[PDB]
Amino acid sequence: EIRGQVASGFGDQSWDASSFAGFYYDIDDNVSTETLTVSDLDGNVIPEGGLVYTTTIADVDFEYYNPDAGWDQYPVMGFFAEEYIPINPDKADKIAKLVLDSDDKYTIRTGEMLDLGEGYAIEAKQVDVDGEKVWLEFTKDGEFVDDEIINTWDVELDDIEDEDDVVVLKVHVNQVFQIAQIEGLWLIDYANAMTIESDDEFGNLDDVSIDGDTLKISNEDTFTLTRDSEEEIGEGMYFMIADTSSSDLRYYPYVE
């Protein structure tokens, strides 16, 4: 249980990352994307449309920052307190998990591998193209995906959540010795990507509105803040509502 700030009385209330520790926040980039609002109370009853979760895409610099190499920003989005990466930086509805955002130095020997996590790997081999060159092979769980010959390599795949031209991997090479030096690795788990649709239900937040770079999700039925109780909002989010008389209302959101 991670709580947010307590709300008092019968007026409106709003939570973001600063006031609710359960929301995604990234301190190095100073970025957050999520809000929860309660509006239009009739006593302790929130009316339809009155409980609203919102999330908006933000952009953050790659760990390996280098504008002169084409490494500027990548998109991020809180989705029910978990970091996700939109596969397209202007569209909130299609997202994947970040596997790596690194600026460390790795070395790959031409016989060798580099396990990137979650069955993603990159293999190096020696090739001839107008002389001796290094050949990097991006694989997944035992399957070819893409190649380049060797500074920024970008892997753009097709049919990722029904989209094309989607960068799932970035690799920057510092140097090659005669073994390669990587400094700049960025990868998303595109094989387990997901899509948010208008018809989706997320607990009692079951009215989904998709507005480009923003997702808004609200309640279709009235939501009652019953006193002396815990009530599910959805996806691990709850409210705790104090045991007071009906002369008061005191409650806070939490994540489990």
Q: Which residues bind a copy of itself (CB under 8 A)?
A: 2-6, 18-19, 21, 25, 27-28, 30, 240, 242-244, 250-252
Closer by beta carbon to a copy of itself, 19 or else 44 = 19
CB of 103 to a copy of itself, least distance (A): 11
CB of 22 to a copy of itself, least distance (A): 8
Is-contact 171 182, C-beta < 8 A?
A: yes
Q: What is the chain's alpha carbon radius of gyration, rounded to the nearest angstrom?
A: 23
Closer by beta carbon to a copy of itself, 61 or else 123 = 61
Alpha-carbon span 189 to 117, nearest angstrom: 9
Closer by beta carbon to a copy of itself, 153 or else 251 = 251
Closer by beta carbon to a copy of itself, 65 or else 132 = 65
CB of 37 to a copy of itself, least distance (A): 18
CB of 162 to a copy of itself, least distance (A): 36
> Could you tell me the two tokens for 126?
């020696």
Closer by beta carbon to a copy of itself, 4 or else 86 = 4
Residue 69 φ/ψ, nearest 5 degrees: -100, 0
CB of 86 to a copy of itself, least distance (A): 24
Residue with tokens 């919102």: 54
Q: 40-64 in b/e burial notation, b at 16+ Cβ within 10 A?
A: ebeebebeeebbbbbbbbbebebbb
Is-contact 237 52, C-beta < 8 A?
A: no
Side-chain half-sphere CA neighbours of 131 within 13 A:
2
Closer by beta carbon to a copy of itself, 61 or else 154 = 61
CA distances from 144 to 31, 207, 227 (A): 35, 40, 57
CB of 144 to a copy of itself, least distance (A): 36
